[PDB]
Design a protein around this ligand. Structure first.
Ligand SMILES: CS[C@H]1O[C@H]([C@H](NC(=O)[C@H]2NC[C@@H]3C[C@H](CC(C)C)CCO[C@H]32)[C@H](C)Cl)[C@H](O)[C@H](O)[C@H]1O
Ligand SMILES: [Mg+2]
Ligand SMILES: [Mg+2]
Ligand SMILES: [Mg+2]
Ligand SMILES: [Mg+2]
Ligand SMILES: [Mg+2]
Ligand SMILES: [Mg+2]
Ligand SMILES: [Mg+2]
Ligand SMILES: [Mg+2]
Ligand SMILES: [Mg+2]
Ligand SMILES: [Mg+2]
Ligand SMILES: [Mg+2]
Ligand SMILES: [Mg+2]
Ligand SMILES: [Mg+2]
Ligand SMILES: [Mg+2]
Ligand SMILES: [Mg+2]
Ligand SMILES: [Mg+2]
Ligand SMILES: [Mg+2]
Ligand SMILES: [Mg+2]
Ligand SMILES: [Mg+2]
Ligand SMILES: [Mg+2]
Ligand SMILES: [Mg+2]
Ligand SMILES: [Mg+2]
Ligand SMILES: [Mg+2]
Ligand SMILES: [Mg+2]
Ligand SMILES: [Mg+2]
Ligand SMILES: [Mg+2]
Ligand SMILES: [Mg+2]
Ligand SMILES: [Mg+2]
Ligand SMILES: [Mg+2]
Ligand SMILES: [Mg+2]
Ligand SMILES: [Mg+2]
Ligand SMILES: [Mg+2]
Ligand SMILES: [Mg+2]
Ligand SMILES: [Mg+2]
Ligand SMILES: [Mg+2]
Ligand SMILES: [Mg+2]
Ligand SMILES: [Mg+2]
Ligand SMILES: [Mg+2]
Ligand SMILES: [Mg+2]
Ligand SMILES: [Mg+2]
Ligand SMILES: [Mg+2]
Ligand SMILES: [Mg+2]
Ligand SMILES: [Mg+2]
Ligand SMILES: [Mg+2]
Ligand SMILES: [Mg+2]
Ligand SMILES: [Mg+2]
Ligand SMILES: [Mg+2]
Ligand SMILES: [Mg+2]
Ligand SMILES: [Mg+2]
Ligand SMILES: [Mg+2]
Ligand SMILES: [Mg+2]
Ligand SMILES: [Mg+2]
Ligand SMILES: [Mg+2]
Ligand SMILES: [Mg+2]
Ligand SMILES: [Mg+2]
Ligand SMILES: [Mg+2]
Ligand SMILES: [Mg+2]
Ligand SMILES: [Mg+2]
Ligand SMILES: [Mg+2]
Ligand SMILES: [Mg+2]
Ligand SMILES: [Mg+2]
Ligand SMILES: [Mg+2]
Ligand SMILES: [Mg+2]
Ligand SMILES: [Mg+2]
Ligand SMILES: [Mg+2]
Ligand SMILES: [Mg+2]
Ligand SMILES: [Mg+2]
Ligand SMILES: [Mg+2]
Ligand SMILES: [Mg+2]
Ligand SMILES: [Mg+2]
Ligand SMILES: [Mg+2]
Ligand SMILES: [Mg+2]
Ligand SMILES: [Mg+2]
Ligand SMILES: [Mg+2]
Ligand SMILES: [Mg+2]
Ligand SMILES: [Mg+2]
Ligand SMILES: [Mg+2]
Ligand SMILES: [Mg+2]
Ligand SMILES: [Mg+2]
Ligand SMILES: [Mg+2]
Ligand SMILES: [Mg+2]
Ligand SMILES: [Mg+2]
Ligand SMILES: [Mg+2]
Ligand SMILES: [Mg+2]
Ligand SMILES: [Mg+2]
Ligand SMILES: [Mg+2]
Ligand SMILES: [Mg+2]
Ligand SMILES: [Mg+2]
Ligand SMILES: [Mg+2]
Ligand SMILES: [Mg+2]
Ligand SMILES: [Mg+2]
Ligand SMILES: [Mg+2]
Ligand SMILES: [Mg+2]
Ligand SMILES: [Mg+2]
Ligand SMILES: [Mg+2]
Ligand SMILES: [Mg+2]
Ligand SMILES: [Mg+2]
Ligand SMILES: [Mg+2]
Ligand SMILES: [Mg+2]
Ligand SMILES: [Mg+2]
Ligand SMILES: [Mg+2]
Ligand SMILES: [Mg+2]
Ligand SMILES: [Mg+2]
Ligand SMILES: [Mg+2]
Ligand SMILES: [Mg+2]
Ligand SMILES: [Mg+2]
Ligand SMILES: [Mg+2]
Ligand SMILES: [Mg+2]
Ligand SMILES: [Mg+2]
Ligand SMILES: [Mg+2]
Ligand SMILES: [Mg+2]
Ligand SMILES: [Mg+2]
Ligand SMILES: [Mg+2]
Ligand SMILES: [Mg+2]
Ligand SMILES: [Mg+2]
Ligand SMILES: [Mg+2]
Ligand SMILES: [Mg+2]
Ligand SMILES: [Mg+2]
Ligand SMILES: [Mg+2]
Ligand SMILES: [Mg+2]
Ligand SMILES: [Mg+2]
Ligand SMILES: [Mg+2]
Ligand SMILES: [Mg+2]
Ligand SMILES: [Mg+2]
Ligand SMILES: [Mg+2]
Ligand SMILES: [Mg+2]
Ligand SMILES: [Mg+2]
Ligand SMILES: [Mg+2]
Ligand SMILES: [Mg+2]
Ligand SMILES: [Mg+2]
Ligand SMILES: [Mg+2]
Ligand SMILES: [Mg+2]
Ligand SMILES: [Mg+2]
Ligand SMILES: [Mg+2]
Ligand SMILES: [Mg+2]
Ligand SMILES: [Mg+2]
Ligand SMILES: [Mg+2]
Ligand SMILES: [Mg+2]
Ligand SMILES: [Mg+2]
Ligand SMILES: [Mg+2]
Ligand SMILES: [Mg+2]
Ligand SMILES: [Mg+2]
Ligand SMILES: [Mg+2]
Ligand SMILES: [Mg+2]
Ligand SMILES: [Mg+2]
Ligand SMILES: [Mg+2]
Ligand SMILES: [Mg+2]
Ligand SMILES: [Mg+2]
Ligand SMILES: [Mg+2]
Ligand SMILES: [Mg+2]
Ligand SMILES: [Mg+2]
Ligand SMILES: [Mg+2]
Ligand SMILES: [Mg+2]
Ligand SMILES: [Mg+2]
Ligand SMILES: [Mg+2]
Ligand SMILES: [Mg+2]
Ligand SMILES: [Mg+2]
Ligand SMILES: [Mg+2]
Ligand SMILES: [Mg+2]
Ligand SMILES: [Mg+2]
Ligand SMILES: [Mg+2]
Ligand SMILES: [Mg+2]
Ligand SMILES: [Mg+2]
Ligand SMILES: [Mg+2]
Ligand SMILES: [Mg+2]
Ligand SMILES: [Mg+2]
Ligand SMILES: [Mg+2]
Ligand SMILES: [Mg+2]
Ligand SMILES: [Mg+2]
Ligand SMILES: [Mg+2]
Ligand SMILES: [Mg+2]
Ligand SMILES: [Mg+2]
Ligand SMILES: [Mg+2]
Ligand SMILES: [Mg+2]
Ligand SMILES: [Mg+2]
Ligand SMILES: [Mg+2]
Ligand SMILES: [Mg+2]
Ligand SMILES: [Mg+2]
Ligand SMILES: [Mg+2]
Ligand SMILES: [Mg+2]
Ligand SMILES: [Mg+2]
Ligand SMILES: [Mg+2]
Ligand SMILES: [Mg+2]
Ligand SMILES: [Mg+2]
Ligand SMILES: [Mg+2]
Ligand SMILES: [Mg+2]
Ligand SMILES: [Mg+2]
Ligand SMILES: [Mg+2]
Ligand SMILES: [Mg+2]
Ligand SMILES: [Mg+2]
Ligand SMILES: [Mg+2]
Ligand SMILES: [Mg+2]
Ligand SMILES: [Mg+2]
Ligand SMILES: [Mg+2]
Ligand SMILES: [Mg+2]
Ligand SMILES: [Mg+2]
Ligand SMILES: [Mg+2]
Ligand SMILES: [Mg+2]
Ligand SMILES: [Mg+2]
Ligand SMILES: [Mg+2]
Ligand SMILES: [Mg+2]
Ligand SMILES: [Mg+2]
Ligand SMILES: [Mg+2]
Ligand SMILES: [Mg+2]
Ligand SMILES: [Mg+2]
Ligand SMILES: [Mg+2]
Ligand SMILES: [Mg+2]
Ligand SMILES: [Mg+2]
Ligand SMILES: [Mg+2]
Ligand SMILES: [Mg+2]
Ligand SMILES: [Mg+2]
Ligand SMILES: [Mg+2]
Ligand SMILES: [Mg+2]
Ligand SMILES: [Mg+2]
Ligand SMILES: [Mg+2]
Ligand SMILES: [Mg+2]
Ligand SMILES: [Mg+2]
Ligand SMILES: [Mg+2]
Ligand SMILES: [Mg+2]
Ligand SMILES: [Mg+2]
Ligand SMILES: [Mg+2]
Ligand SMILES: [Mg+2]
Ligand SMILES: [Mg+2]
Ligand SMILES: [Mg+2]
Ligand SMILES: [Mg+2]
Ligand SMILES: [Mg+2]
Ligand SMILES: [Mg+2]
Ligand SMILES: [Mg+2]
Ligand SMILES: [Mg+2]
Ligand SMILES: [Mg+2]
Ligand SMILES: [Mg+2]
Ligand SMILES: [Mg+2]
Ligand SMILES: [Mg+2]
Ligand SMILES: [Mg+2]
Ligand SMILES: [Mg+2]
Ligand SMILES: [Mg+2]
Ligand SMILES: [Mg+2]
Ligand SMILES: [Mg+2]
Ligand SMILES: [Mg+2]
Ligand SMILES: [Mg+2]
Ligand SMILES: [Mg+2]
Ligand SMILES: [Mg+2]
Ligand SMILES: [Mg+2]
Ligand SMILES: [Mg+2]
Ligand SMILES: [Mg+2]
Ligand SMILES: [Mg+2]
Ligand SMILES: [Mg+2]
Ligand SMILES: [Mg+2]
Ligand SMILES: [Mg+2]
Ligand SMILES: [Mg+2]
Ligand SMILES: [Mg+2]
Ligand SMILES: [Mg+2]
Ligand SMILES: [Mg+2]
Ligand SMILES: [Mg+2]
Ligand SMILES: [Mg+2]
Lengths: 48, 275
RNA sequence: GAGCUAGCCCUGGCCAGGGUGAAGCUGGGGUGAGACCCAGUGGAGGCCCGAACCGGUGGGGGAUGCAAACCCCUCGGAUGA
RNA sequence: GAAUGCCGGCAUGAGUAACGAUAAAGAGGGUGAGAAUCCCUCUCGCCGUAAGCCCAAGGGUUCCUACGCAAUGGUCGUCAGCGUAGGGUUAGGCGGGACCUAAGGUGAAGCCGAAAGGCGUAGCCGAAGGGCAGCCGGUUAAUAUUCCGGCCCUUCCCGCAGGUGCGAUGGGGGGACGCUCUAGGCUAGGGGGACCGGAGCCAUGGACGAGCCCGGCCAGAAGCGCAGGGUGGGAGGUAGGCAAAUCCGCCUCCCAACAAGCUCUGCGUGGUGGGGAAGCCCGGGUGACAACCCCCCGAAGCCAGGGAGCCAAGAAAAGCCUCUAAGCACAACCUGCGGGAACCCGUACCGCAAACCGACACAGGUGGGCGGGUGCAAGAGCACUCAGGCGCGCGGGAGAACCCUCGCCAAGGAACUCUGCAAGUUGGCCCCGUAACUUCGGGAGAAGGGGUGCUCCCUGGGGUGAUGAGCCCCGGGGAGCCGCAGUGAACAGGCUCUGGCGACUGUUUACCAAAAACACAGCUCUCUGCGAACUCGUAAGAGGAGGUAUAGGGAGCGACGCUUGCCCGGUGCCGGAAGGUCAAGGGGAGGGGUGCAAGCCCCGAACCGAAGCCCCGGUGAACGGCGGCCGUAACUAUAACGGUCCUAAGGUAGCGAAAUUCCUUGUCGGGUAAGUUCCGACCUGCACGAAAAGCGUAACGACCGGAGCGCUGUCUCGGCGAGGGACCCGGUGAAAUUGAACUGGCCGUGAAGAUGCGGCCUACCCGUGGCAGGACGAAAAGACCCCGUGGAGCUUUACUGCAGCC
RNA sequence: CGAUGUCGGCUCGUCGCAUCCUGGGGCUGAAGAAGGUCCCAAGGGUUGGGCUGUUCGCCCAUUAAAGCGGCACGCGAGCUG
RNA sequence: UGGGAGAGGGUGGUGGAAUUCCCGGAGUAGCGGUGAAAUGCGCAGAUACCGGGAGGAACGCCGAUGGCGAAGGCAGCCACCUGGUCCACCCGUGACGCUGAGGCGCGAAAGCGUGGGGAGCAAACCGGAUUAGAUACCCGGGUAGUCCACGCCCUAAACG
RNA sequence: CCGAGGGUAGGGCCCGUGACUGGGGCGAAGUCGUAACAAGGUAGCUGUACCGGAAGGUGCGGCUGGAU
């Protein structure tokens, strides 16, 4: 049956991407958090 | 004169459609339309703020001339009478001798090829627009401004009319389509005659699909819901209201008046509506 | 978090084939004029049968499954909300 | 040493289940240490509106070649989507960007909000929509509309020539639009040919044939031909298109009108460039100077912005054309020709799947295009097949029980059972024929029956063409033949009668409920005069609605028919400039503290003082409610009638043992041999009743009852047969569970149901196929029940707040 | 209560005897035939159907008879539901 | 041919009296109603009176024992459209007539459907009286309906 | 071939009968009221509509076959 992950490169970049995070106080805290933890990726990869 | 169908489907048994008799022209004036932005009932927050809306047929908005005091003294010919999906009345197309073209809503009796004019000097004739103070008492008018130069606000739906009753200073007394007696400023405009397409009230939608075409999604009864949803929700089996009949938001819905108390226009209502 | 699901918005797309045969129109009859009657034409419809497509009625299987909802038979809608 | 402890390790179950669609395999020859599993050949089978091909998304090297087999692959492996290495993706024209706008998003102006931020016109962004210039063939191991060959084309820059009032983000035209149906002419695609080209073939009884088999094209600029789309010409006036305007709009006159002219597109032709089979011979070569023609069918595609009808009335913006303003008219633009210039990103491969979403090489999910032929009435249905692609990554045997899927069955025919559950029956088309009732549509495929193949003969009409032959499409009459049987295989209704509920088509608890539930047209009440009511929001702002009482919000009822009674005392809502009560405030009789005092400070009665409540009315399709006892008729029984108590008023019509009736399987009637169900009645209705509508109602229903016919393995009552498993052998090899176990019966005993205690009985040691009585078997710290001064949803005239409103 | 699945049916039995039938008896208000009542006896047997979820019960047609109880109201790691 | 009378019919328009309601003023202790009363209404200012406004229905006097129409029936006034009828002249046609089963059309009131309208009146209904009772007669209220448009119904002591 | 008739299926008319139900006729001395005949104590009758134990009442219109 249809499952929940239906990948969509535009959907991924526009929802979770770097520029979406930066436009919002909650998003920038996300980036600040993942930086402070030392994450190798601050944001999901999408090939665009 | 509404048209019936033979009962060759269960829905055709009761469906009635307008006769469309008065329509002389079947595609709109390209210079006088714009896209009609469907809302579905959603506001700028994206929230449903008027329930049960959406999915109706696509429409273009016909720009309607609700002033006409734009062009005092410039007569106009009645080019056509057209269908407008955005309102119940029909609309009439005007080719002004100016060369300008405009739509007005079509009063009862207006004929293609007649002339119309607007102004204090205008003949009291169906289709003409005058300030209220110059129309003789007792005249049946429509498309009435509520305040000078603010645009026709009253008596615009198919068949409606306001009737002039008297004068009091700078003000005239109107009987609105609802039966309220109100004072409207004598400089407000109005058009002689009543709005046409009176048979509009006698249309029988006929089946559920018709309401869907109009943008009317199914309306679900409070009694049918759950207590999270509505005062009338819940109960084992069916249930009477069991409390004063109420809206989804708790306020009472069988008699409770809701016009704002100290509204400044109260000075100008003479008598609330009838029946 | 609405890439699942619910509703709406914008813009595109899809619905084999077969059946029934509304209004209207033409002619004919009829009448003072009409209604109305007959034949032909016509091709309406949340019309009928049935694939694609959308469903999920009954039964059987499956039950450490092929599958955290599947498989077979049967069954509903299929120009429309 | 225990915490259903935590982390790890290793056991048991066990060589057990399983090894993932029952589309299917067999042999020969290769390779290699090793072969059911890799490569090659022959044979068999499976898909073929796909299980073939082409796009898109998503994936991201998986593509090609060499060398490999530890692990991955449910077995094997020499193979591979695996390991190592090298190679591979080429564009002005295809897709996206250097173009346009849609929802939406963003947002100079502006508005709002403790902060963060929320809005917001223009503008900007935003595509699978608009717009825009490339078709055919060849080539590589791997890319091709990209490279190459042939023929075409677009834009930018510069120059030459001719022409013209040139000039825009401004004005205008255009772009520009629905649904159903559909004309003409074509094209795609297909069938046939006694005509054209071809390596061959003659079999096993016949055939050297008007024989078999194979093929008979594709692209193409200008012209030209056919078919279509689009489009009036001129003049005079002019106040409108937010400047101007010769343009557009409006008015008048003249001429043209289903035309024509001009323009645009499709198809055909067209210089030229290509392709070219079976077969045979090692992807190649030959065939081959291959031939490339005739007839028929024919789109849903094309001409297209075509036509008609209908109501629910069907994007925007740019390109483009025209008009002018500053300007500039040494310019500028337009047309033709010429040279030059023409960037960035994608392009491999998978793509109904082993490469995407499902933890798996997972019977599931995934949008668009092409999708051949024959027969069956048609068709994308069904059977078989082409091209193409597969046999589903464990096999070999055996021929038990039992299980699954499937075939048949004497006699009976629902006796099965909660129920005909299931499975039979029926089944397409043509013809004859078809009931109550009905809203006149229907009910209807009602029911029920007859026909159906093949051969010969005679013949009617239609398309193409030519009016004819040929081909092709609908028919009609007669005479015959064979079989158990002619929709001979596959696909393809069982029917009727009568209740309940819901009018109907629809919708729903994704994953135990599809219904009588929700919705629904329709009916009624009520709010709302527009800066509407109402809804979201602190607000600004939005929705309502660019709507205006024939409109919009809220509520209940639920097509239609005939109807919807009585109660306003209580609650609600509506009306009520009185009266009562009433807060802050006003007022200040009169007290109090302090000071020598002027004064400072404190308390404070009458009186005035809103909404709300009190009070007076109205109001039921507002919340709701609609009696009790006793007596009475010339047989009896029963009471039309009366008495009295109570109420705000005592249930009307219609209906009733009901989706409601307790007693109850009430009683009577029908149906049956027999009927707690069913249907029809009766009425002492425990406990119907009129918009939480009452009573009906044609049609409809995968709804729930009852009956009958048909027919059956449902059953009496079971038998046999098929395949996939179970079983045996080779390969790979789980699981929950598990205190340890050397783990029998009876009768007792025991915390009251003992393998484990007592007494007695029985019993050599160990397995394999089977069955499920026990191990109070497994699973899940009972979801029932209670307990906890545990929790959470929901309600209200519980308490107390708050939003909102007054 | 860190679960001892609960009505009815079906299938499969096994046991008790306070015996429904068949076998053996005494008493009788036992003439015969047929019964009544009590005693012994558990070897075997103890039907098909309509109604209802039913157990039970009522009914139809038969029968030698149409027994009554236990086995976790026997039996859901056997099925139904 | 020329004339006449008439509430004959259909459409649109329009005039005054009266009732009810609403607004203003003036004013006060009752009004109303009946056989007598009560319900009802009124100091929250009724009734009676004066000015203003809205709306509906019906047309006083003329009016008659009258007129018209086939019947049902038709009554303010105005205009338009239309029927029947009588008389004079003796001009035209030349028996072209009478009746009329079926058919068709008209058809008071009440009633029905869909819209609208709603002053007064008023089935049902509620209340007050009366009465043994009073589902009546009398009184205070009061919904259909009475009115308009369109479409049905087709009845009558449709009678002379 | 036709064919008595037999069978399957479906309709039409008529007769008899049916729980129960509807009114009707009749029947020496039942119960309730008093609608009509006199102005019958509300003049009556009437088509229709609504209501009520019953006769009846009431509304709208009509008739005199109404009295003074
Ligand atoms: C579905 S079987 C599934 O649950 C079973 C469980 N039974 C019980 O808990 C029983 N305890 C007594 C209770 C009594 C009542 C008496 C009645 C009158 C209410 C009957 C119900 O149960 C019984 C569920 C509740 Cl029936 C067993 O745990 C079984 O082991 C498991 O497999
Ligand atoms: Mg899904
Ligand atoms: Mg998706
Ligand atoms: Mg994407
Ligand atoms: Mg995308
Ligand atoms: Mg997206
Ligand atoms: Mg976002
Ligand atoms: Mg982003
Ligand atoms: Mg911040
Ligand atoms: Mg990480
Ligand atoms: Mg790093
Ligand atoms: Mg992130
Ligand atoms: Mg109709
Ligand atoms: Mg009809
Ligand atoms: Mg019209
Ligand atoms: Mg536009
Ligand atoms: Mg909007
Ligand atoms: Mg917005
Ligand atoms: Mg937002
Ligand atoms: Mg709303
Ligand atoms: Mg909405
Ligand atoms: Mg409207
Ligand atoms: Mg309109
Ligand atoms: Mg005003
Ligand atoms: Mg309506
Ligand atoms: Mg619409
Ligand atoms: Mg609605
Ligand atoms: Mg609803
Ligand atoms: Mg509910
Ligand atoms: Mg509910
Ligand atoms: Mg919620
Ligand atoms: Mg709540
Ligand atoms: Mg609530
Ligand atoms: Mg409730
Ligand atoms: Mg409920
Ligand atoms: Mg409920
Ligand atoms: Mg209930
Ligand atoms: Mg209720
Ligand atoms: Mg209640
Ligand atoms: Mg409430
Ligand atoms: Mg409110
Ligand atoms: Mg009002
Ligand atoms: Mg978020
Ligand atoms: Mg999505
Ligand atoms: Mg379809
Ligand atoms: Mg289509
Ligand atoms: Mg026809
Ligand atoms: Mg037509
Ligand atoms: Mg349909
Ligand atoms: Mg059919
Ligand atoms: Mg599904
Ligand atoms: Mg299923
Ligand atoms: Mg089945
Ligand atoms: Mg499951
Ligand atoms: Mg399946
Ligand atoms: Mg199937
Ligand atoms: Mg169908
Ligand atoms: Mg179809
Ligand atoms: Mg310990
Ligand atoms: Mg554990
Ligand atoms: Mg623990
Ligand atoms: Mg431990
Ligand atoms: Mg652990
Ligand atoms: Mg471990
Ligand atoms: Mg370790
Ligand atoms: Mg281990
Ligand atoms: Mg082991
Ligand atoms: Mg074992
Ligand atoms: Mg297993
Ligand atoms: Mg498996
Ligand atoms: Mg399969
Ligand atoms: Mg197959
Ligand atoms: Mg072989
Ligand atoms: Mg082999
Ligand atoms: Mg091998
Ligand atoms: Mg090997
Ligand atoms: Mg294999
Ligand atoms: Mg091979
Ligand atoms: Mg095929
Ligand atoms: Mg991947
Ligand atoms: Mg390996
Ligand atoms: Mg290996
Ligand atoms: Mg190695
Ligand atoms: Mg492996
Ligand atoms: Mg595997
Ligand atoms: Mg090797
Ligand atoms: Mg490559
Ligand atoms: Mg190129
Ligand atoms: Mg550039
Ligand atoms: Mg900000
Ligand atoms: Mg964007
Ligand atoms: Mg695009
Ligand atoms: Mg392009
Ligand atoms: Mg080209
Ligand atoms: Mg190479
Ligand atoms: Mg030029
Ligand atoms: Mg120019
Ligand atoms: Mg256009
Ligand atoms: Mg448009
Ligand atoms: Mg478009
Ligand atoms: Mg449409
Ligand atoms: Mg071509
Ligand atoms: Mg063909
Ligand atoms: Mg000008
Ligand atoms: Mg084109
Ligand atoms: Mg050669
Ligand atoms: Mg198509
Ligand atoms: Mg087109
Ligand atoms: Mg726009
Ligand atoms: Mg200048
Ligand atoms: Mg110069
Ligand atoms: Mg650049
Ligand atoms: Mg490529
Ligand atoms: Mg698939
Ligand atoms: Mg596909
Ligand atoms: Mg693959
Ligand atoms: Mg997942
Ligand atoms: Mg596999
Ligand atoms: Mg798969
Ligand atoms: Mg072919
Ligand atoms: Mg067929
Ligand atoms: Mg296989
Ligand atoms: Mg397969
Ligand atoms: Mg064996
Ligand atoms: Mg199978
Ligand atoms: Mg067979
Ligand atoms: Mg048999
Ligand atoms: Mg039978
Ligand atoms: Mg039989
Ligand atoms: Mg049965
Ligand atoms: Mg049944
Ligand atoms: Mg059942
Ligand atoms: Mg069958
Ligand atoms: Mg069949
Ligand atoms: Mg057949
Ligand atoms: Mg019948
Ligand atoms: Mg019939
Ligand atoms: Mg029937
Ligand atoms: Mg019927
Ligand atoms: Mg009929
Ligand atoms: Mg048939
Ligand atoms: Mg038929
Ligand atoms: Mg025949
Ligand atoms: Mg044959
Ligand atoms: Mg034969
Ligand atoms: Mg069928
Ligand atoms: Mg339904
Ligand atoms: Mg339902
Ligand atoms: Mg119903
Ligand atoms: Mg109904
Ligand atoms: Mg309904
Ligand atoms: Mg449907
Ligand atoms: Mg559920
Ligand atoms: Mg469900
Ligand atoms: Mg679920
Ligand atoms: Mg269903
Ligand atoms: Mg529902
Ligand atoms: Mg319904
Ligand atoms: Mg209704
Ligand atoms: Mg209404
Ligand atoms: Mg709010
Ligand atoms: Mg708006
Ligand atoms: Mg409903
Ligand atoms: Mg009826
Ligand atoms: Mg009350
Ligand atoms: Mg009251
Ligand atoms: Mg009250
Ligand atoms: Mg204060
Ligand atoms: Mg107060
Ligand atoms: Mg109550
Ligand atoms: Mg009460
Ligand atoms: Mg009644
Ligand atoms: Mg009863
Ligand atoms: Mg009932
Ligand atoms: Mg009851
Ligand atoms: Mg009962
Ligand atoms: Mg009972
Ligand atoms: Mg009984
Ligand atoms: Mg009986
Ligand atoms: Mg009784
Ligand atoms: Mg109820
Ligand atoms: Mg019915
Ligand atoms: Mg029915
Ligand atoms: Mg249904
Ligand atoms: Mg159903
Ligand atoms: Mg039956
Ligand atoms: Mg069997
Ligand atoms: Mg076998
Ligand atoms: Mg062996
Ligand atoms: Mg082994
Ligand atoms: Mg292995
Ligand atoms: Mg031990
Ligand atoms: Mg041991
Ligand atoms: Mg042992
Ligand atoms: Mg032992
Ligand atoms: Mg004990
Ligand atoms: Mg024991
Ligand atoms: Mg032992
Ligand atoms: Mg022991
Ligand atoms: Mg001991
Ligand atoms: Mg012992
Ligand atoms: Mg012992
Ligand atoms: Mg023993
Ligand atoms: Mg073994
Ligand atoms: Mg075993
Ligand atoms: Mg066991
Ligand atoms: Mg077993
Ligand atoms: Mg056990
Ligand atoms: Mg235990
Ligand atoms: Mg056990
Ligand atoms: Mg057990
Ligand atoms: Mg479990
Ligand atoms: Mg726990
Ligand atoms: Mg517990
Ligand atoms: Mg638990
Ligand atoms: Mg519970
Ligand atoms: Mg307890
Ligand atoms: Mg406590
Ligand atoms: Mg405690
Ligand atoms: Mg608690
Ligand atoms: Mg709480
Ligand atoms: Mg327990
Ligand atoms: Mg445990
Ligand atoms: Mg059985
Ligand atoms: Mg004996
Ligand atoms: Mg004897
Ligand atoms: Mg004897
Ligand atoms: Mg015995
Ligand atoms: Mg029983
Ligand atoms: Mg029992
Ligand atoms: Mg019983
Ligand atoms: Mg005997
Ligand atoms: Mg027993
Ligand atoms: Mg016992
Ligand atoms: Mg017991
Ligand atoms: Mg018991
Ligand atoms: Mg049991
Ligand atoms: Mg079980
Ligand atoms: Mg059981
Ligand atoms: Mg068990
Ligand atoms: Mg067991
Ligand atoms: Mg007073
Ligand atoms: Mg006073
Ligand atoms: Mg009025
Ligand atoms: Mg003469
Ligand atoms: Mg009449
Ligand atoms: Mg009284
Ligand atoms: Mg008295
Ligand atoms: Mg008379
Ligand atoms: Mg015979
Ligand atoms: Mg007596
Ligand atoms: Mg009388
Ligand atoms: Mg009398
Ligand atoms: Mg009298
Ligand atoms: Mg009297
Ligand atoms: Mg009365």
């Amino acid at each position: 049956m249809k499952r929940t992950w239906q990948p969509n490169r535009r959907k991924r970049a526009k929802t979770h991407g770097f520029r979406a995070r930066m436009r919002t106080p909650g998003g920038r805290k996300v980036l600040k958090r993942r930086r402070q933890k030392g994450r190798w990726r601050l944001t999901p990869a999408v090939r665009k | 004169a509404v048209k019936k169908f033979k009962p060759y489907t269960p829905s055709r048994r009761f469906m009635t459609v307008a006769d469309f008799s008065e329509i002389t022209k079947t595609e709109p004036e390209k210079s006088l339309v714009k896209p009609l932005k469907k809302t579905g009932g959603r506001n700028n927050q994206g929230r449903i703020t008027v329930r049960f809306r959406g999915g109706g047929h696509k429409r273009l908005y016909r720009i309607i001339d609700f002033k006409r005091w734009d062009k005092v003294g410039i007569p106009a010919k009645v080019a056509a009478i057209e269908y407008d999906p955005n309102r119940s009345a029909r609309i009439a197309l005007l080719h002004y001798v100016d060369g300008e073209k405009r739509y007005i809503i079509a009063p009862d009796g207006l004929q293609v090829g007649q002339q119309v004019v607007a102004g204090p000097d205008a003949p009291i004739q169906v289709g003409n627009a005058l300030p209220l103070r110059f129309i003789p008492v007792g005249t049946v008018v429509h498309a009435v401004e509520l305040e000078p130069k603010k645009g026709a606000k009253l008596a615009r739906a198919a068949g409606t009319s306001a009737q002039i009753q008297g004068r009091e200073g700078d003000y005239v007394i109107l009987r609105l389509p609802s039966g309220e007696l109100r004072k409207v400023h004598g400089e407000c405009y109005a058009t002689v005659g009543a709005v046409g397409n009176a048979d509009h009230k006698n249309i029988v939608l006929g089946k559920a699909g018709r309401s869907r075409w109009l943008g009317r999604r199914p309306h679900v009864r409070g009694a049918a819901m759950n207590p999270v949803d509505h005062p009338h929700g819940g109960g084992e089996g069916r249930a009477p209201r069991g409390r004063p009949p109420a809206s989804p938001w708790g306020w009472q819905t069988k008699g409770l008046k809701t016009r704002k108390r100290r509204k400044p226009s109260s000075r100008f209502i003479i008598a609330r509506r009838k029946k």
